[PDB]
Amino acid sequence: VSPQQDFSDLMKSWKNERCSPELLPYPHQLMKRLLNRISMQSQLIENISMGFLDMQNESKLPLLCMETELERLKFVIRSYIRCRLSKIDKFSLYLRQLNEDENSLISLTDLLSKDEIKYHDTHSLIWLKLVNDSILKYMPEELQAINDTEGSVNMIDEPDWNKFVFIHVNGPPDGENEFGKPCYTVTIPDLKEEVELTIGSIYVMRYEVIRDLLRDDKVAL
Amino acid sequence: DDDNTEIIKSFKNFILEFRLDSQFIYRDQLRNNILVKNYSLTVNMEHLIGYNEDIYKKLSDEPSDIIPLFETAITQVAKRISILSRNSLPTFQLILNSNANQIPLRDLDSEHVSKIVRLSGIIISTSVLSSRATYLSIMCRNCRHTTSITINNFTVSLPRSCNCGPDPYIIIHESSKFIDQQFLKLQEIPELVPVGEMPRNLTMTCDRYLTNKVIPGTRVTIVGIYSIYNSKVAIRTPYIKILGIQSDVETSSIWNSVTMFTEEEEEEFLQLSRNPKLYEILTNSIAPSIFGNEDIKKAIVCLLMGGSKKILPDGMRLRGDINVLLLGDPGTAKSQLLKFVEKVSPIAVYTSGKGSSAAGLTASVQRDPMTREFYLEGGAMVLADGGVVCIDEFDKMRDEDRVAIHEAMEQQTISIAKAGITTVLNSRTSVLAAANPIYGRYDDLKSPGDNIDFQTTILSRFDMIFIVKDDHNEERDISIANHVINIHTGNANAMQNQQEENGSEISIEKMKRYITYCRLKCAPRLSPQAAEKLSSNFVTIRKQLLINELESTERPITIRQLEAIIRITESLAKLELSPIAQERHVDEAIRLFQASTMDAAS
Amino acid sequence: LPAHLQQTFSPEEIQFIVENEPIKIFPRITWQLITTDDKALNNMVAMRSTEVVLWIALLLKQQSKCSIVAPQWLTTKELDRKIQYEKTHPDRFSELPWNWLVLARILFNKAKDDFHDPIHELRGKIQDLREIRQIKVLKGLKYLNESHLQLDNLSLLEINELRPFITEIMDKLREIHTASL
Amino acid sequence: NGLDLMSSITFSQQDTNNLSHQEQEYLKEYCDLITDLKSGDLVDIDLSGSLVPPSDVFIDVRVLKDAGEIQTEYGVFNLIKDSQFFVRQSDVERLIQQGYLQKI
Amino acid sequence: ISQFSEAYNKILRNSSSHSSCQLVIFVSCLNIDALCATKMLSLLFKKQLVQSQIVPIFGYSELRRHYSQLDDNINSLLLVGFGGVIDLEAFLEIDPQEQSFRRDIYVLDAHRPWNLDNIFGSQIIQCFDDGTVDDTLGEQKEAYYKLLELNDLSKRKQRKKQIHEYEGVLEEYYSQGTTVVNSISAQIYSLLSAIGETNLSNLWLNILGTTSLDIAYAQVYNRLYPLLQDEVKRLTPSSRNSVKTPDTLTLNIQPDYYLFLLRHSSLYDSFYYSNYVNAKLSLWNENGKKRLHKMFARMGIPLSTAQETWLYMDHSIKRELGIIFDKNLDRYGLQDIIRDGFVRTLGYRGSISASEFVEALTALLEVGNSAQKLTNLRKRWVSNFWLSWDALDDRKVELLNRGIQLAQDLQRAIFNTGVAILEKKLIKHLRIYRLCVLQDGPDLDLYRNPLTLLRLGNWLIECCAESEDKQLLPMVLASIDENTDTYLVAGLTPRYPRGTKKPILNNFSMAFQQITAETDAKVRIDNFESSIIEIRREDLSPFLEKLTLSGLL
């Protein structure tokens, strides 16, 4: 609830976001209080700003400091969201491949923001308009579907949990999963054995094997 | 030498310390080039004079005794840069250039000897690669003492100390290290300072990464050092050792080649292609001098780009790009024109011969009278390969290899079976024929053919053939005659072209880089129907010139003429930077040779 | 659609990251400011050591109503111990503040006046530091294999600037290797 | 889009005719969709704007043959040919992409 | 008429607000005195974090164009180099706007005499003359307070006679030679000094600002060395090297020379395009050419070494250069070259005297790029003004060097041209004044620039008159290329040979006004500077007959 932890995990979400292999949950539970909080002092600052016109018949330093703080914080979430919107487009089909399925975790309110689901299907729909009126007419029957054939392939892609990324390990230690020699963690790779890990050590590998540790907040990217 | 070692420290200082705000340019440059395996660095003498004047004051004094020292430190610099220790690392090259101050060649005597001289001139001919020592070691013929000499630059015979005597040492050839040396033969610039006399050639020598940097026959700038060696009183041969050498603009070019890239070119070259006037603005690039003659004026451009050259298996290959005739009455501007044309070419040779100036128009292999053994002496056509062919006086060309022109233009080659050598060597050179027709306007009331020597076949060998006829006619003159006095003083027409530079026109030293640019991309090609159009156009060109010949008129047309007009298409298209060619695209190439078809009708 | 970069962060951006780190300053001044992530402060004692975020200090240093302290890690005699450790440990990269290269340019741009003799000194020491570290990087690059990477101590600038090359490549490695089965 | 005040995709994307009509309709329909992302936030965003991080905070922008002034928003800064300023990052973002402003 | 601290701390009160501001500089105009002054001033505003628009006006009338064009909520105003003669309250009008008026205006200049409207009747200004000219100037004191508010028959001609005494007094003021006095830069320097700030930059900007005019008189500039050298003694960058250092790296005094482009150009051509060498040693002459080679025959210097680049001349030739000069140059009357003035150092990038660094700034002014064509053109000049603005900025030294070589280009045009006019002998002694005219030649567009003819006729007045005894005479030059005969024409005044008895006060500022008060057909005061006007060839020849009489001076 600490306003600083808000931005700490906002950057955590952002920094993890662009470097991420594929789209991850929308942190509305905390962002919400943010997207309101921004407008809070966005309105306040103008009261003390026009209130600074009341002394006009000196200290603008924290004035434009506070002002700056906004655009600096507001820009933050931009790259975060926009990147997601992109990965949505990039994955737009797979998102529906997980969507039509029952199991397991779906868009819902759970993965996408309301604007994100709207943008999602409106984009894939209008995409369908554009692809259908132009190259599907002209649309022989087995070709009438845009999805798996099977092969090859198509999108499908990209549930690539396998991809390589840079990481930096951290957690508020019991001193759980800590086995030594100085520090945690495992676990062993799909085709290989354990390395393993320490928090002071940055260990680059498949996003799958490490993914849980992003979910656990056990490692930075 | 510990004095020289203090100087060594002085240069290590010079590198580690120096800053242009804030990166240390030479320092970056090193780790940059060590992965280039350049093992050399180009240093501004002005960042040096800016760093410490002292070291230059002594450097400018006896640089020869220092230049290697300068290297012995920077070769150590890589040691403290390339890797950490506690291989093998080659002894560095250094190449230094500076804005300096230009000096003319004719005035170079004594005085400045054993110092730095910036100067240009032009290279005539490249010597063959000659490798020289870097490290060598030797066991004694008698005591078997193992000596190690580091041979350094810049003679020095082998030291004899461990009968033992007089000097019992022979090179360990197995373990030794090496470098190339060029031996440039280069000539003063054509313009200054011949006075009355002949141009001098003063000999200089490249080594290592300096070698093969410069084409034979291109304008260049060398800095180097003026020095002497005996070479059989005391009468020792004048020369200059070379550091560092820099190409005169660009020249870069060779090989494959260069851009590099400076992105604005692609855009600026594409915008050219988006300019509908670009073809015609190229036409307006060609003669700031010549107002009018727009026809042949359009004809020059299409050659330089290179035309279709397609190699299809088997070894059959068709030439590019083509040939052109400037033959016409004096007053054509065609020599003035040609003296534009050659300066346009990135690489070419201007021939008014006979062959130019003293050149066997084809390479004439001539024995080295020393150590016997014929070696090919090169040729104007040979050196001009992949470049323009300039010809005046084509009425007078050497008759025997006139045929080698009759051949090289077509088969893109010259076969020399003479003496020992059988090698068929490349001239892909594209000819432009500027000769003056027999008796001027007198071959017009006659048969216009056989004008060129005794056969009409030369025309077939050529392509875009153009007869320039200037009658004394009104007002086409009074405007170019008006153009004249402007052209002369004060360049009242040469100012008027500079606002067309800002408004429209090309800079033409640019035009080099343009034509260099789009000749290195793969060959353009027409879509099928413009070709079939060449078929119904030509079936009537040929039909027309049999029917024209219903008068039993001797002549002119071939099947290499149609194909000739083909190559003009891919030329004018290579302007566009487009893999294809449009119907009308080709069509103005048709209207462009169409005047030559009436040259057949006249 | 970001297009650029896109996976990797722009150095331009990562500087925006590090600019969010805490540091000490020497205020000239004796509302609130309110802000968000700031907490502090009440009117902050002039000419005393105090902890703030970087970018604010950057801006007030631009008004010169504050002075930024040199990080206690950043000094000549210190760089010596670290670079020496670097030469005697051909494999490990030793130890660094990790936002440092950015910090270097950042401070030298403006904060230059506060240090004692950084000029013509540290920029060289860190150029060389980055040098031997860079060759340690590049030489470590032959062990490059799937799937394991220990970059251990390496800076975010250091890393990010080269990110595309190991990432993109290593995928071409692992993919084909496990693909063998 | 592009950015204020986009205020239209008209003349933007110069292809116009050259871009096939199915794509023309599609594209303009798609930025019709993106306008709804301008509806969703409520930031205010300026997703189209504010691509690159802020600093700091004030710059000097010079105008290139641009008038102007359109400056009714906020306050009127009087655009003239060869006019530069000293101003915060905020107002820059629009006329810097609008092509009017230049130097950073 | 106020000390700077007051008006400055007051402009603060109207200074910060968002959106800005509202106050703005008017850079005026192409004359260099503002440029440094504006820049330091710019930095000042940038140091106090205050938004300001930056306007590079050119034309005098163009000022009216701009003030009337867009100023809305503007609460305060800056202006430079203008209104030292004509009042804007008349020119703009203005009119009262809301005591404690809605808008403040600042105006700076060294040109004299001030307008009568300038010190008194404070509305727009906020007269900036302080503390230069008090004077008094007790004549404007009677120009109002005796004038205002102005037996009944005999006191009528009495009141009108005393008023005619104030009329005949005040008539002489405002009718008088117009002259520059002090580089505004040092005013803003002592202003910045009053505030307590001194930056080595700002003093170097002061140098360039003061130095800006050094081809023109001094006159206080002679005593400005102390007002500067002392500040150079006020700056002690270090007790000692500290080699180099690569940074700071700051200026010192040294043997400067009136000789031109010394550091970056050949010593030969340095003597050769140089102004002081020209007239004294007769440069258009081949006689003085060979005679110059006699100087090296006393300098022990090769003609080659004269063709040499300054960077490569022997350290020996450098150290002994001045002493050599002392042993020789005193022969031909060249003893006044040597000057002890100021030289900036970027060290590794080289060192440049102020005097030198001036010229390339003046290069970017004319080069380095139906009545609408010349407005578009003036607009191009104002465009290339900015490249000179950044050419003040050290951050890019490279763009500066453009204009640096360009100086060799400029002078190569000029020097050649002047001689070209000398062997033609285009001089007409007339009676009252020497005058010439240029009908045509190469690069007349380059002669469109007020400064090209300014430098030109400067070089040519130094040339035509050293003296060159006797009785130095004022000058005028003219040229045309395009526009149907705008005939750019400028007024000019003789420079003494370094030994100035009097200020000398150009009368053509008034005289050209007498012709604009005359038939004034085709005459154009569109120029900011009274020294120069546009004129049509059709009426310029009678403008010349009307220039003959009445001779005012």
Ligand SMILES: Nc1ncnc2c1ncn2[C@@H]1O[C@H](COP(=O)(O)OP(=O)(O)NP(=O)(O)O)[C@@H](O)[C@H]1O
């Ligand atoms: N546009 C122009 N058209 C014609 N003549 C020109 C033109 N511009 C310049 N000239 C002048 O006229 C001459 C043109 O060359 P020209 O008289 O045709 O000799 P040439 O034919 O080119 N030399 P040659 O090949 O031996 O016949 C030059 O010497 C110029 O002085």
